[PDB]
Symmetry: C2
Subunit: 314 residues, 2 copies
């Protein structure tokens, strides 16, 4: 099997924040203070290695900025664990309380996950400053993310094979790209009208697809090993186009090439909103660029470790 590099045409290159190993400890301290880690649960947690992910995607900056980058990825883990054996309606209330903790960090929390959420976002606004419009964008993205996951666990145990179109509509919210992008953009004070511009949304959608499909390609070998390969884009493509695994990977390479080319073209054709926000929007998608590359780096290294492997029998 030949596995194409879906990001060969993605200009942003992999860079590890050097300040890791200097926040990796106090970051792992913080999380354990909120999660009663069982043995075997601490394993797969640290075998995922969410702090490295923060170092690959977050701004290259102060030790405090790498701090909040580590908390985001760790908070995503903690939120999923805290709501693991919760029902749909309970999960929706928990997510709504988490979003209230983000909106008002001055108000006190009422449980482990609202306190975690309150601390992490209070730290973030200390480091990054006030950003009314950015904060609203992030909470809106966090809401669409939590909804998609809670309501996909409500769909689970069903015999329908998802089409390629329906795979993307769901995975654009489930993969957690959108709230990662809007979080790393906090402080840029981008106006609400720019976030609602179709070319902003279009570039956001293209970058999310790349996070979803790279994650599925890099995890597919693992997934198909133990019948976890049912919700993968490769399975959707093989089923819908009646082609073998090799075919579906060439297909993704084509799909990826068009997606990247439209991301870059849309960047070059954005409207101007004057010099100040233009620099902000320039910086925003620079951060998205680093984020897509950083997810692909981490998602390749962790879900099939080895070295520079390119051909397997699976």
């Amino acid at each position: 099997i030949y596995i194409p590099d879906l990001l060969i045409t993605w200009p942003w290159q992999k860079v590890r924040n050097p300040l890791l190993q200097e926040v990796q400890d106090e970051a792992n301290e913080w999380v354990k203070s909120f999660v009663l880690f069982e043995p075997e649960q601490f394993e797969k947690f640290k075998a995922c290695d969410f702090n490295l992910l923060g170092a690959l995607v977050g701004p290259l900056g102060t030790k405090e900025e790498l701090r909040i980058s580590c908390d985001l990825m760790n908070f995503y883990f903690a939120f999923d664990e805290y709501t693991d054996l919760a029902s749909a309606d309970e999960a929706k209330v928990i997510a709504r309380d988490v979003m209230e903790s983000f909106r008002h960090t001055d108000k006190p929390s009422h449980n482990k996950i609202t306190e975690m959420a309150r601390q992490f976002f209070e730290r973030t606004i200390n480091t990054v400053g006030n950003d009314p419009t950015g904060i609203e964008q992030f909470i809106a993205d966090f809401d669409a993310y939590t909804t998609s996951i809670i309501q996909e666990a409500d769909d689970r145990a069903s015999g329908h094979i998802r089409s390629v179109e329906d795979y993307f509509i769901l995975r654009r919210d489930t993969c957690g790209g959108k709230p990662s992008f809007s979080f790393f953009g906090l402080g840029l004070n981008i106006p609400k009208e720019v976030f609602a511009h179709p070319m902003f949304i279009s570039m956001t959608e293209s970058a999310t697809d790349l996070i979803a499909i790279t994650n599925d390609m890099h995890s597919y070998n693992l997934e198909q090993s133990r019948g976890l390969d049912g919700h993968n884009v490769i399975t959707a493509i093989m089923h819908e186009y009646k082609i073998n695994l090799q075919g579906a990977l060439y297909w993704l390479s084509g799909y990826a090439t068009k997606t990247i080319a439209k991301f870059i073209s849309d960047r070059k054709n954005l409207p101007s909103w004057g010099p100040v926000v233009d620099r902000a929007v320039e910086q925003y998608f620079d951060r998205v660029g680093r984020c897509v590359r950083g997810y692909d780096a981490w998602s390749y290294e962790t879900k099939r470790y080895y070295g520079k492997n390119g051909l397997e029998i699976q």
Copy 2:
């Protein structure tokens, strides 16, 4: 080799204007009047079958509307023939004169190709009415089309294998999609500002890629049955991604799927410009839809007739 259907997700369906056979004569009794056909030259002209293209592609309407639709396709051929043995700077002058013939149908012409151009456009404006903004769009599309072909024939006899990105930048002008779209849109009186809207340009680019890649895929067997065709998108993909023919076709299927999905998404997210313009833009891309399907229909039937079984081991 398995050949995918690149337009399987394209909602517009193939429909032949029933008024063909009733316009095919008097329309073919026009090109003969302007081109001195030699044997072997009148062959491929009736073996290309440009009036069926007009019937597959143009609006389903009056016999006069099918007339102007067949004139455009016929004019594209007659222009290439008239400028076949011309130099680069000579070809630019002839193209500039033709565009002047479109701008001023009242003024007399000075040669075969300016008279044909004048007679075709006066008829077109008799049928569809005046369209100042639409006429400017079409002439701009026709300028970029003639320029691209004149400069490709001038660069030719060079050692460069063109990359995938450079293949698309050229072929978006060379395939004649853009002037076809703006021509079939004549009469809709779309505002100059809607033509310059990046979502209008993006949808236009997406539909042109589909015209370029369907034509190459449907002509690739012919093109390689006679060499290796170094100017085909399949050649560019095999070279650039170091994959075989089968691989490059799966790649195209993925590239087409993303392109189509972005065309439909972009249509659904156009801004509103009021009730009159919105109906105009709805009709414009409905016609582009029919045009893309119609080109794919014609170029599958012409370049390798046979039938649709799926497989063709060549």
